[PDB]
Every structure is written in structure tokens, then in C-alpha cells.
Amino acid sequence: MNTPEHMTAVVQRYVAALNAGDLDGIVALFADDATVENPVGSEPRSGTAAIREFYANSLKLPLAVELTQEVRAVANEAAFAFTVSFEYQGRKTVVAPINHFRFNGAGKVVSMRALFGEKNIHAGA
Amino acid sequence: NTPEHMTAVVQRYVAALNAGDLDGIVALFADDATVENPVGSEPRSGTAAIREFYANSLKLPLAVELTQEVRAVANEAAFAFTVSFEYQGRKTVVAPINHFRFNGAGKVVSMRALFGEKNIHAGA
Ligand SMILES: C[C@]12CCC(=O)C=C1CC[C@@H]1[C@@H]2CC[C@]2(C)C(=O)CC[C@@H]12
Numbered sequence: 001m002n003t004p005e006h007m008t009a010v011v012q013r014y015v016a017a018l019n020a021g022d023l024d025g026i027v028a029l030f031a032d033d034a035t036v037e038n039p040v041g042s043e044p045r046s047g048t049a050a051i052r053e054f055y056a057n058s059l060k061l062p063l064a065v066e067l068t069q070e071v072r073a074v075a076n077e078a079a080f081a082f083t084v085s086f087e088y089q090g091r092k093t094v095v096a097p098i099n100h101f102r103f104n105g106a107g108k109v110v111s112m113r114a115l116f117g118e119k120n121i122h123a124g125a
Numbered sequence: 126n127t128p129e130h131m132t133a134v135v136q137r138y139v140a141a142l143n144a145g146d147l148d149g150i151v152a153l154f155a156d157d158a159t160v161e162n163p164v165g166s167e168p169r170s171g172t173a174a175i176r177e178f179y180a181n182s183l184k185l186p187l188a189v190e191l192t193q194e195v196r197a198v199a200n201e202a203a204f205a206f207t208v209s210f211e212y213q214g215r216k217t218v219v220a221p222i223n224h225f226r227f228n229g230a231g232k233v234v235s236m237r238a239l240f241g242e243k244n245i246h247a248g249a
Pocket residue numbers: 018038058059084086095097099114116
């Protein structure tokens with residue numbers, strides 16, 4: 001089933017799910033033995049339980065998430081630029097990563113990696 | 126590798142494509158680096174092949190421009206950009222996202238360029 005059209009749709013779904021705080025729908029996009037490496041450089045989380053815990057932890061504050069450019073999708077991989085916004089104690093932060101998804105034949109994500117650093121975290125005092 | 130180093134290297138890449146400075150591009154890479162253009166394709170490997178690649182890439186003048194901030198962390202960077210060229214009166218703009226991994230010496234050990242057909246923007 002995996003096509004560039006499918007992978008683009010999955011990226012759009014992943015954004016929508018984060019927006020909604022929908023753990024079931026985020027985790028559903030992943031293969032059972034997938035990895036999540038967030039940020040790049042950290043120990044990968046491996047398999048459904050670990051992936052759900054990771055997203056649960058990321059979702060404790062409501063996130064407003066938005067693609068900021070066209071999805072790049074080719075072969076069996078996709079990359080996307082987006083922002084994740086949240087508020088805590090009256091301060092708004094906007095984080096701007098680039099994520100990479102690798103997909104299996106069935107169109108499930110087998111690996112996510114998220115590149116961002118301190119310069120991509122935008123907050124006032 | 127500081128994020129500032131890796132960000133600067135990305136800007137150097139962009140500047141050297143703009144300037145058609147083939148030395149300038151190839152110098153960013155490790156001895157034994159790979160370039161995958163597009164992501165799904167067999168990589169060019171080693172200095173000679175990487176140079177050949179970029180020589181072919183510079184047959185037409187290119188206009189290249191970062192379209193967002195660089196993301197750099199650990200020993201890796203990713204960047205959203207455009208590269209435009211003009212051929213027989215038509216302009217094409219390709220909008221990839223590229224990934225570089227850097228070695229301890231701060232040289233690029235791999236590039237991948239992720240763009241698909243929907244990232245190639247051209248009229249008639
Ligand atoms: C995990 C995450 C969402 C899922 C995704 O795809 C990419 C990211 C990267 C930035 C994370 C964010 C979740 C909320 C985080 C932890 C913050 O409060 C600061 C950094 C930010």
C-alpha cells in the first residue's frame with residue numbers, strides 16, 4: 001500500500017493526531033516494532049508500549065501542531081517541517097523541528113527521527 | 126559538532142552551489158562520504174564520484190536558498206530549501222529537505238536529499 005500519496009497522508013494524520021491529543025491515532029501509524037528517536041542523538045524508544053509512553057509524555061500540555069511547508073515524500077520515506085506550540089504558566093513556546101519517517105511495505109512507520117535543537121525552540125521569558 | 130558549525134556548513138553548501146564553486150562543495154565532505162540524490166537512489170561514494178555528481182549538478186546555473194532555519198543536533202543537520210534552474214525558457218524549482226551527518230572532524234559523511242515528484246514545481 002505504501003506510496004508517496006499514502007505517506008503524505010500519514011504525515012498529515014500524524015499532525016492532526018498530535019493536534020487533537022489522540023494517542024491511539026498517533027500510535028496506530030507506527031509498525032509494532034517501530035522506533036522513535038526524539039530528538040536525534042537520544043536513545044531510541046522501541047515498540048508500541050514505549051512509543052505510546054513517549055507520546056503520552058509529550059501530550060501532557062495541549063499542543064498546536066502545524067505543517068509549515070509541503071511534505072517531502074519519495075521511495076519509502078518522508079520528511080516534514082512543522083511547528084509544535086504550547087503554553088505553560090502564561091508563556092508560549094514554539095518549537096520548529098524537521099521530522100523523518102521511514103515506512104514499511106504496508107505503509108506503517110517503522111522509524112521516526114526528529115531533528116531539532118535549542119535554536120529551534122522559540123520562547124520569550 | 127556545534128549546531129553553529131553544522132548550520133554554517135549548510136550555508137556554505139548553499140553558497141557554493143550558488144557560486145558554482147565545485148571545490149567549495151566537495152571540501153565539505155569526508156574522504157569517504159556518500160551523497161544520495163534523491164533519497165531513494167544508489168549513492169555516489171567517495172571524493173571523485175561526489176565531485177562528478179556536483180559537476181553534473183552545475184551544468185546549468187543554480188539559484189539556491191534556505192527557506193527556513195536549519196535544525197542541527199547531535200552530529201546531524203536537516204534543512205528545507207529550494208534550488209531553481211532555467212532550461213529552454215522554463216524555470217523549475219525543486220524543494221527538498223536535506224540531511225547531513227557529520228563526523229568528529231566536522232566533515233559531512235553523508236548527505237541525503239529527500240524530494241519527490243510533488244516537490245518539483247514547473248509550469249509548461
Ligand atoms: C516530541 C515532540 C512532539 C512529537 C514530534 O513529532 C516532535 C516533537 C519535538 C519537540 C517536542 C515535542 C513534544 C513537546 C516537547 C517535548 C516540548 O515541550 C519541548 C520539545 C517538544
